[PDB]
Nucleic acid binder design. Structure first.
Ligand SMILES: Nc1ncnc2c1ncn2[C@@H]1O[C@H](COP(=O)(O)OP(=O)(O)OP(O)(O)=S)[C@@H](O)[C@H]1O
Ligand SMILES: Nc1ncnc2c1ncn2[C@@H]1O[C@H](COP(=O)(O)OP(=O)(O)OP(O)(O)=S)[C@@H](O)[C@H]1O
Ligand SMILES: Nc1ncnc2c1ncn2[C@@H]1O[C@H](COP(=O)(O)OP(=O)(O)OP(O)(O)=S)[C@@H](O)[C@H]1O
Ligand SMILES: Nc1ncnc2c1ncn2[C@@H]1O[C@H](COP(=O)(O)OP(=O)(O)OP(O)(O)=S)[C@@H](O)[C@H]1O
Ligand SMILES: Nc1ncnc2c1ncn2[C@@H]1O[C@H](COP(=O)(O)OP(=O)(O)O)[C@@H](O)[C@H]1O
Ligand SMILES: [Mg+2]
Ligand SMILES: [Mg+2]
Ligand SMILES: [Mg+2]
Ligand SMILES: [Mg+2]
Lengths: 327, 33, 319, 426, 330, 332
DNA sequence: GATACGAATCTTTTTCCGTATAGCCGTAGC
DNA sequence: GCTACGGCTATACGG
DNA sequence: GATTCGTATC
């Protein structure tokens, strides 16, 4: 029944050896568990970095056949108020071991979305039952956590997945699904994911769906761009060239052609232009300020809706005005 | 728990960790009376 | 199969002599233990500087053998409401426990900053009637959270950040009692990443020794990360816009920090900044506020942070 | 072997640390409330914490209650910790007030209510308001005098979801007692002020002279004067001052002297934002301390309205129009930030910076006032009622609907000059 | 009877036009059973609800639809409590056993779909409870989040759900559908018509269908029997006539504040909309070759700012007057 | 009783001030079955509500102008409801911000081509519109909403997409003068000349309601007569705004700013909308001949910025005082 | 007799419906 | 027949 | 915190 699953859920690692990328964290937690003592962990980083697939694999490797009665998992999908923390967590972390297997792991996923009162009531539970219970905290935003809670928690930072790890996972997915992927399409997947395994898995699933024959046909870069409606680098470069060099009429015509022939959204083009403009000379310091401020204002306006033609004209005019400080 | 061969209720409970060492000692001392 | 206490719990101070930092306050606590006339105290300070440990050590050295039934350690984990203050605290304070001369029961109301207003109002009443037999020992990160009527009859002993020398002394004691190979640069890096937090330094040392063995700067920095309030200050104080943009994109974005965290840390650093004009400070605060609004609305992107940095540099360097 | 705020406690009325005018007015009010006539029934004492708001009532009752009592001495303070078996906690105060009304002749005893019930809970709060309201409007010919010492204190930040407001911000009398009680003709609200430095120094010197052997033994009797001056100048709380003095005297070392920090009042905070602080000449430090110590006051929209309504007090309003324009523009910008703490910081930093570059010596300042927004909202509600009545009578007579906007703009003005001007003719 | 928008709503996935990528992904996953969590987004009136309803009816059938599909939108409560209780309980429920007829004539996938339309109006507090809910109950339940602004969707939910973007229905996308509707409804139009309809209804087809229906009704009431002209659908939509626009431009050229204010007062008396006149001014000024680059940049930024202010819900008169004064003083 | 209600048309043919709009309404009423959701946008006083009533009478026969007032209750939001045969009235003014729940309940109760008229749709909050964008689309077989608003700018894009845009131009001077002549013919006032009606029309700025009310007020003041030099009875708040404009253009000081703030507080206590207060202050400031073109451009720029700020803000006093301070600084 | 000091004044106030249960009432049974 | 108990209920509190 | 008035005292 695992085939009738999304690729982001049936490719979830079950062992620590399948969690690519976070090599330092994996090695450190392996040393901790091999040496017995495991400090109170706190996993932080961008979403989709493997902060849950790592802790669940660690729990499975520690409590073999006992992942159920030794691990208590609470997330934002369930209530985690004062009453919950003071009753359920306390009762679970205050009782003796089932078979004297070790310590009782408590996984608190998405602990950032927790009230400060609960985060302060949890600290004494963490410190007073640390002999037989070790707490793990998963959070994407560190500012939501009490500084004392951060103090009484060893911090492991799950950085965005490097290119090598995502490439290895893509290779494994290709082998498991009997698929073919072009290297350019793989690089496009790398740049689209921007450090997120779930994005890569979803785009690969959509590409396999988009193929007439998922067996004898290879997922090309054009498929990877069409399945997500993302702008190709060529059209972004053409738009940037038209805005920077040609007059106002031809630049507007090119922008309309690019956004119409492929249906590309304006915000995606704005992000692409921002990325292509980062590795630019721009000797004058005012050009950078004008570009960043005007493009951020236009992106904020787009996030609230409006007239796409006016916003595109604003983009063109802003870029031209910012690059007039060049000469 | 036992009351067809009736109804059988089989329950299981975990034991608290008993953090205080003097708690067991004071319970033993109290039980001496 | 662990059965091994953490180094934070392993070498926890049991005496008022090995508690490093705040020499004058520790000496005052030692004098209190010697005499016994403990007044009501509200210990305040940053997390992880010995506030709770000092209270527990002084309770142990005052009550002594009567520590089992002489101290009532209440906390945020336990229920702390008006009902609990009116029954459990009332009965503990009202209890007639024989004690050595000049000894009083110590109600350890740790994390008192998280207590409800009605509970503190009932604490006022119970402390007004029971202070000749019991002496409450509050412990909070901010004294303002405890109501002023409660602070009226309670002496205040504010704790300060542990220095780089007391932390080094305690770390060396732990190293000697554990026989751990160390490096001078490693201990300096541990102190630097501690930011005055002794418990954090102990945890970092334990992680370093358990994951890499020898404790040097490289092994400390390959597991522990430099404080982001410092990279934020570095990028906010950068004279050139390109330098700040790089410091952001490589040390806060690719490192894996959310934009909202970058904005909040920037606001806090600007609040606690120095060598900057007041007009510049308020303009930077306004820009940070606009960026915070944009992040909250759902536009959280690197572009907004870059725009914030551009605005800050524009208001710093003028036109 | 005990705290110095006890033992060395006042024994007569003279020892009480209170100003002469405050003592005389409190005594006059008590003497008026003990007469057979009942012009005033309750005395609502109020003030900051530890401002001799409790130690004076007992001393007055020592020489007032026995004089007017019958023959055939102290107070009847309400204990909020007595959990009666067959009695709900709300009914505890009800029983207290219903059994304290029998102390008139041969049983006269003043009723002191310092520890209020859990007024943070809405139900018992309104039950208490009703109970004290019944006391004022009671048909009882004779009732004993009653005093409610509401110790005002700034309630800190809390995790309560909404639970309205007022009692979640401050513990003042207005947040417990309602407007009907405050404006009742039989209520006399005598507010108290922080203890002045002179009386604090006098009482600290009395404590020191009553125990000097240990002071000279610990080489502190010669350093006593500076300690007394610093303690009496840093805090206005007598009990806190005595506790700090005891802690310093009993100690043996070089521990710095510290005391509780007072919370800055609303008008005080407005003055600090507008004018500044004489203690600290650094704007950043002052603003940071103000936000850290009192953030529950600078977060309310009233404080921004307070600045808007009170920034015209600098130099009586003779400052440049550009400064006022900048101040109001930044206030509007902060209003346009949906209450972020950054907006709260900026809206005060800009005002303080603007009022610093134009600070001119020898310029008299005016007085401040609370923002005129409650009057405006009451007038708006009255206009709402008027418009509702006009639209109700309009639809009942003829089938014509009119939008409330048009009623406010066009119909409302012309309706009198049409209908009543033709009533003249009839 | 029924409005033309609801009468020609796509019933099956083969009728949704120009959304080729998402619709073909859904059609291909219809054969299989690995449909992932979906995040439909795009301009309003682009065919998200129609597409999800078509997929729902194709996968399960009318009888199984009620027992295997839950729909929640802005019309109902979608708070944190609702997400925590109703969505979680529905997802936990075992998928109902299809009948023999359902298995014979429908694919009947082993999962069920929770449709959360207009999810951009859901608070971030209630969007955090869906994270694990759409992850642990993934093999028995599927989630379809529909919104107009992805920015309102939190990053975790956007990462968990697949990103399907619905393209804007321009005059080269929904023209075939509009012509089909006109032919089925017996509508007589001139050459070039329905192109102005798609252009005025930019990034939307429902507005275009409504305009076509209104023009058809007007033509039927007239009784002439002649085809519908472009100016008719232009005036019916609310587009400012070109003569009024050129008069506005001429008043702008003569930089007299009093004359501009008087003519703006007259224009607001006419009752036109600020958004339409701003869009038409943009189209006139940007396209005109007579102007230079600097003027075009400044006017583009001014129009952007004016549209941003108008979208906030401000007075049209003041914004239009300020914009025209700025253009005059340029 | 009132002349506005006395001479209110009760049918499509009775309407004789738009012509083209009346013909379009006839076209819409020719087939009452396929009635799309209607959104009337135009200047206030045009007669959009009267046009909606006439259209409903055309669809639902006579008796539409009936008035079955009743009181409802929502959770205690006890908003009054004006019911009529196949016609219900909803005013977003009576419930600000909290309008979403009450409009949802009313819509679901009406659903049970019933028409519900929601006037001044601009006052609807972004949440009520968010509910309505699905309420209209879902139950579009048993209810047809018709909404009239002054300007559709604060209306979300989906609602404008699902509804039909119909423009209602304000009455012209000649036709409104003709309407005034018909009024004075039905109830004789013995006008000295017809020029006074034209001047009243010019002083109404296309608001027929304002023209009728001021004509009735002047007739009552002149004892059922009219005079060539009869004073124009403008609303009091407009006079107060003109006085405030004079104060601003005369006293450029901070005490004058305090006086202006007091005047603004009085205006707000008169329940006058803040946006229209800012608009009238701006336009009265632009009418002063002493100020030069640059000053007027600065005035209009500040007006735009501060009305945007007021739209994106809670407290209205701040923005008005800021605009006054900015214009005062510009003047000197 | 001059001056530091201190008090009055500068202020406005809004909700959970449900529920496990201690005592009360009808009642199965010895 | 009265009891001791199961179900009902008015309700102070809960979050 | 700033203003005005008011005693009280060295
Ligand atoms: N290192 C990895 N190697 C392979 N697949 C990975 C890796 N990290 C994540 N994934 C995949 O991404 C999915 C989601 O990751 P999770 O660990 O469940 O969530 P997360 O990474 O913690 O992000 P958040 O903050 O919880 S939304 C997993 O189920 C895997 O399929
Ligand atoms: N001065 C110190 N000397 C030695 N160990 C210390 C010192 N301060 C803190 N620690 C260590 O910190 C750990 C626990 O410190 P705590 O006193 O619980 O922290 P805290 O100061 O109470 O701050 P919070 O508010 O409770 S997080 C133990 O491992 C102690 O050994
Ligand atoms: N000279 C003195 N004057 C006043 N209080 C004194 C003095 N000497 C000792 N005290 C003690 O200081 C305390 C002050 O009590 P009060 O201020 O009257 O009570 P209070 O004002 O109600 O304080 P709150 O509001 O409950 S914090 C009492 O415990 C007194 O016994
Ligand atoms: N691709 C399409 N093909 C055919 N008709 C379409 C298409 N997209 C939209 N429509 C028409 O649009 C109407 C229904 O659109 P909806 O899907 O309800 O709107 P939407 O895409 O959900 O945008 P909203 O309502 O603002 S969330 C019907 O009249 C459809 O015929
Ligand atoms: N064609 C017309 N002829 C005469 N009077 C009219 C006509 N149309 C509207 N009115 C007048 O307009 C008044 C109602 O205006 P109203 O509908 O409130 O305008 P708006 O919809 O702009 O608020 C009625 O009193 C009526 O006398
Ligand atoms: Mg996870
Ligand atoms: Mg602690
Ligand atoms: Mg007292
Ligand atoms: Mg939809």
């Amino acid at each position: 029944s695992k085939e009738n699953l999304p690729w982001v859920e049936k490719y979830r690692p079950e062992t620590l050896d399948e969690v690519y990328g976070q090599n330092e964290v994996i090695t450190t937690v392996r040393k901790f568990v091999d040496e017995g003592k495991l400090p109170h962990l706190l996993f932080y980083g961008p979403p989709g970095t493997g902060k849950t697939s790592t802790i669940v694999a660690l729990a499975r490797e520690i409590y073999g056949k006992n992942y159920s009665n030794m691990v208590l998992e609470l997330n934002a999908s369930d209530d985690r108020g004062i009453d919950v923390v003071r009753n359920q967590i306390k009762d679970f972390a205050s009782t003796r071991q089932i078979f004297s297997k070790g310590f009782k792991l408590i996984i608190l996923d998405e602990a950032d979305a927790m009230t400060n009162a609960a985060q302060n009531a949890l600290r004494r539970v963490i410190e007073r039952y640390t002999k037989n219970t070790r707490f793990c905290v998963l959070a994407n935003y560190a500012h939501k956590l009490t500084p004392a809670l951060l103090s009484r928690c060893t911090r492991f930072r799950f950085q965005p997945l490097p290119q090598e790890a995502i490439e290895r996972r893509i290779a494994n997915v290709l082998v498991h699904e009997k698929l073919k992927l072009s290297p350019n399409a793989e690089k496009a997947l790398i740049e689209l994911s921007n450090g997120d395994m779930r994005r890569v898995l979803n785009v690969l699933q959509s590409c396999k769906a988009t193929l007439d024959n998922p067996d004898e046909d290879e997922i090309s870069d054009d498929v990877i761009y069409e399945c997500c409606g993302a702008p190709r680098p060529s059209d972004l470069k053409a738009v940037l060239k038209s805005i920077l060099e040609d007059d106002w009429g031809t630049a507007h015509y090119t922008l309309n052609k690019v956004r119409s022939a492929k249906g590309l959204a304006l915000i995606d083009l704005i992000e692409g232009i921002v990325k292509i403009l980062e590795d630019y000379e721009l000797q004058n310091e005012e050009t950078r300020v004008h570009l960043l401020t005007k493009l951020a204002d236009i992106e904020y306006s787009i996030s609230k809706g409006g007239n796409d033609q006016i916003q595109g004209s604003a983009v063109i005019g802003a870029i031209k005005a910012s690059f007039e400080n060049e000469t | 728990i036992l009351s067809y061969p009736g109804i059988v209720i089989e329950v299981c409970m975990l034991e608290k960790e008993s953090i205080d060492e003097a708690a067991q000692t004071e319970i033993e001392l109290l039980m001496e009376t | 199969l662990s059965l091994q206490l953490p180094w934070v719990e392993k070498y926890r101070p049991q005496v008022l002599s090995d508690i490093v930092g705040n020499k004058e306050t520790i000496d005052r606590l030692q004098q209190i233990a010697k005499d016994g006339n403990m007044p009501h105290m509200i210990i305040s300070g940053m997390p992880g500087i010995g506030k709770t440990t000092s209270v527990h050590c002084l309770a142990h050295e005052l009550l002594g053998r009567s520590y089992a039934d002489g101290v009532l350690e209440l906390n945020a984990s336990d229920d702390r409401g008006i009902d609990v203050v009116r029954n459990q605290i009332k009965h503990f304070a009202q209890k007639k426990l024989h004690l050595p001369p000049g000894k009083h029961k110590i109600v350890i109301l740790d994390e008192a900053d998280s207590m409800t207003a009605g509970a503190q109002q009932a604490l006022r009443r119970t402390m007004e009637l029971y202070s000749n037999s019991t002496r409450f020992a509050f412990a909070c990160n901010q004294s303002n959270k405890i109501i002023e009527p409660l602070q009226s009859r309670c002496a205040i002993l504010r704790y300060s950040k542990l220095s780089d020398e007391d932390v080094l002394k305690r770390l060396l004691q732990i190293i000697k009692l554990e026989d751990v190979k160390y490096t001078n640069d490693g201990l300096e890096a541990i102190i630097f990443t501690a930011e005055g937090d002794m418990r954090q330094a102990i945890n970092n040392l334990q992680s370093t020794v358990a994951g890499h063995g020898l404790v040097n700067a490289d092994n400390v920095f390959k597991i522990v990360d430099s404080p982001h309030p410092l990279i934020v200050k570095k990028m906010l104080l950068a004279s050139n816009l390109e330098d700040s943009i790089q410091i952001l994109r490589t040390d806060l974005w690719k490192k894996g920090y959310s934009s909202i965290d970058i904005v909040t840390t920037s606001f806090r650093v600007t609040k606690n900044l120095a060598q900057v004009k007041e007009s510049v400070r308020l303009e930077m605060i306004k820009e940070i506020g606009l960026t915070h609004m944009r992040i909250l609305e759902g536009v959280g992107t690197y572009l907004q942070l870059a725009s914030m940095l551009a605005k800050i540099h524009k208001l710093n360097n003028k036109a | 072997g005990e705290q110095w705020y006890e033992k060395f406690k006042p024994n007569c009325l003279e020892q009480v640390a209170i100003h002469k005018r405050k003592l005389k007015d409190v005594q006059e009010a008590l003497d008026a409330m003990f007469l057979p006539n009942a012009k005033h029934r309750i005395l609502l004492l109020s003030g900051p914490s530890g401002c001799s708001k409790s130690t004076v009532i007992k001393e007055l009752s020592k020489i007032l209650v026995p004089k007017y009592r019958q023959n055939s001495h102290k107070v009847t303070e309400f204990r909020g910790d007595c959990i009666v078996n067959d009695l709900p906690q709300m009914e505890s105060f009800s029983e207290f007030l219903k059994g304290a009304r029998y102390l008139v002749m041969s049983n006269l005893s003043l009723i002191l209510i310092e520890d209020l019930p859990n007024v943070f809970h809405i139900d018992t709060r309104r039950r208490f308001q009703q109970l004290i309201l019944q006391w004022l409007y009671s048909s009882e010919p004779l009732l004993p005098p009653l005093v409610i010492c509401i110790t005002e204190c700034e309630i800190p930040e809390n995790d309560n979801n909404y639970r309205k407001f007022g009692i979640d911000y401050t513990f003042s009398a207005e947040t417990i007692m309602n407007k009907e009680i405050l404006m009742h003709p039989r209520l006399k609200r005598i507010k108290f002020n922080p203890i002045n430095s002179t009386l604090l120094k006098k009482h600290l010197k009395f404590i020191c002279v009553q125990n000097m052997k240990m002071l000279k033994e610990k080489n502190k009797w010669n350093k006593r004067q500076e300690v007394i001056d610093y303690i009496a100048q840093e805090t206005g709380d007598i009990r806190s001052a005595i506790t700090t003095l005891q802690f310093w005297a009993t100690s043996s070392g070089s521990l710095p002297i510290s005391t509780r920090e007072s919370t800055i009042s609303y008008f005080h905070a407005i003055g600090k934002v507008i004018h500044g602080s004489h203690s600290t000449n650094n704007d950043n430090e002052m603003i940071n301390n103000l936000f850290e110590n009192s953030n529950n006051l600078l977060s309310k929209e009233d404080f921004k309205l307070g600045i808007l309504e009170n920034y015209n007090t600098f130099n009586k309003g003779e400052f440049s129009i550009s400064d006022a324009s900048s101040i109001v523009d930044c206030l509007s910008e902060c209003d346009n930030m949906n209450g972020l703490p950054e907006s709260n910081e900026y809206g005060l930093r800009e005002v303080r910076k603007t009022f610093r570059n134009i600070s001119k010596q020898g310029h008299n300042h005016g007085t401040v006032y609370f923002p005129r927004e409650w009057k405006v909202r009451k007038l708006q509600n009255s206009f709402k009622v008027q418009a509702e009545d006009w639209l109700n009578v309009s639809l009942y007579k003829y089938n014509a609907v009119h939008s409330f906007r048009n009623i406010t703009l066009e119909f409302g003005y012309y309706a009198p000059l049409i209908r009543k001007c033709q009533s003249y003719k009839k | 009877q029924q409005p033309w928008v609801e009468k020609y709503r796509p019933k099956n996935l083969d009728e949704v036009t120009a959304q080729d990528h998402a619709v073909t992904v859904l059609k291909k996953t219809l054969k299989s059973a690995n449909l992932p969590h979906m995040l439909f987004y795009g301009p309003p009136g682009t065919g998200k609800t129609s597409t999800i309803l078509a997929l729902t009816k194709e996968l399960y059938g009318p009888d199984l639809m009620k027992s295997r599909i839950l729909e929640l939108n802005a019309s109902d409560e979608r708070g944190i409590s609702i997400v925590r209780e109703k969505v979680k309980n529905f997802a936990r429920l075992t998928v109902s056993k299809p009948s023999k007829h359902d298995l014979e004539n429908y694919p009947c996938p082993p999962y069920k779909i929770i449709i959360l339309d207009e999810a951009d109006s859901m608070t971030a507090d209630a969007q955090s409870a869906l994270r694990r809910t759409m992850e642990t109950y993934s093999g028995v339940t599927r989630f379809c989040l529909i919104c107009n602004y992805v920015t309102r969707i939190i990053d975790p939910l956007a990462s968990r759900c697949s990103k399907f973007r619905f393209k804007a229905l321009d005059a080269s996308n929904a023209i075939d559908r509009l012509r089909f509707i006109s032919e089925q409804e017996n509508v007589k139009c001139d050459d070039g018509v329905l192109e102005r309809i798609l252009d005025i209804s930019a990034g939307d087809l429902r507005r275009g269908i409504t305009l076509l229906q209104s023009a058809s009704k007007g033509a039927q009431y007239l009784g002439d029997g002649k085809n519908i002209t472009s100016t008719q659908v232009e005036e019916l939509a609310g587009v400012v006539p070109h003569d009024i626009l050129i008069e506005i431009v001429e008043k702008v050229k003569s930089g007299d504040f009093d004359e501009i204010k008087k003519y703006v007062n007259t224009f607001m008396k006419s009752g036109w909309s600020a958004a339409s006149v701003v869009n038409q001014l943009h189209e006139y000024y940007i396209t005109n070759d007579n102007f230079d680059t600097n003027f075009k940049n400044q006017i583009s930024w001014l129009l952007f700012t004016t549209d941003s202010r108008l979208n906030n819900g401000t007075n049209e008169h003041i914004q239009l007057l300020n914009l025209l004064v700025k253009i005059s003083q340029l | 009783s009132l002349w506005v209600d006395k001479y209110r048309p009760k049918s499509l043919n009775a309407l004789s001030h738009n012509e083209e709009l009346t013909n379009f309404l006839k076209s819409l009423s020719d087939q009452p079955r396929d009635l799309p959701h209607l959104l009337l946008y135009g200047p206030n006083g045009t007669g959009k509500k009267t046009r909606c009533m006439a259209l409903l009478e055309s669809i639902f026969g006579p008796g539409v102008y009936r008035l079955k007032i009743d009181v409802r209750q929502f959770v205690k939001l006890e908003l009054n409801v004006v019911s009529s045969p196949y016609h219900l009235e909803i005013t977003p003014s009576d419930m600000g911000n909290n309008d979403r729940i009450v409009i949802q309940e009313l819509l679901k109760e009406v659903a049970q081509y019933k028409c519900v008229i929601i006037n001044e749709a601009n006052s609807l909050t972004k949440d009520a519109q968010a509910a309505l964008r699905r309420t209209m689309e879902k139950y579009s077989k048993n209810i047809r909403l018709i909404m009239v608003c002054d300007s559709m700018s604060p209306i979300i894009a989906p609602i404008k997409s699902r509804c039909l845009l119909i423009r209602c131009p304000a009455p012209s001077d000649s036709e409104i003068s003709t309407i005034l002549s018909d009024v004075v013919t039905n109830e004789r006032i013995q006008l000295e000349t017809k020029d006074i009606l034209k001047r009243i029309a010019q002083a109404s700025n296309g608001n027929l309601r304002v023209s009728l009310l001021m004509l009735e007020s002047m007739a009552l003041n002149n004892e059922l007569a009219l005079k060539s030099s009869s004073p124009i009875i403008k609303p009091d708040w407009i006079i107060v705004i003109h006085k405030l404009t004079r104060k601003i253009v005369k006293e450029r000081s901070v005490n004058s700013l305090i006086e202006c703030r007091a005047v603004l507080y009085d205006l707000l206590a008169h329940c006058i909308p803040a946006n229209i207060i800012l608009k009238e202050l701006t336009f009265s400031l632009l009418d002063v001949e002493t100020l030069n073109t640059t000053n007027k451009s600065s005035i209009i720029e500040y007006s735009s910025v501060f009305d945007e700020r007021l739209s994106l803000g809670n407290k209205a006093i701040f923005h008005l005082e800021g605009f006054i301070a900015k214009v005062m600084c510009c003047l000197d």
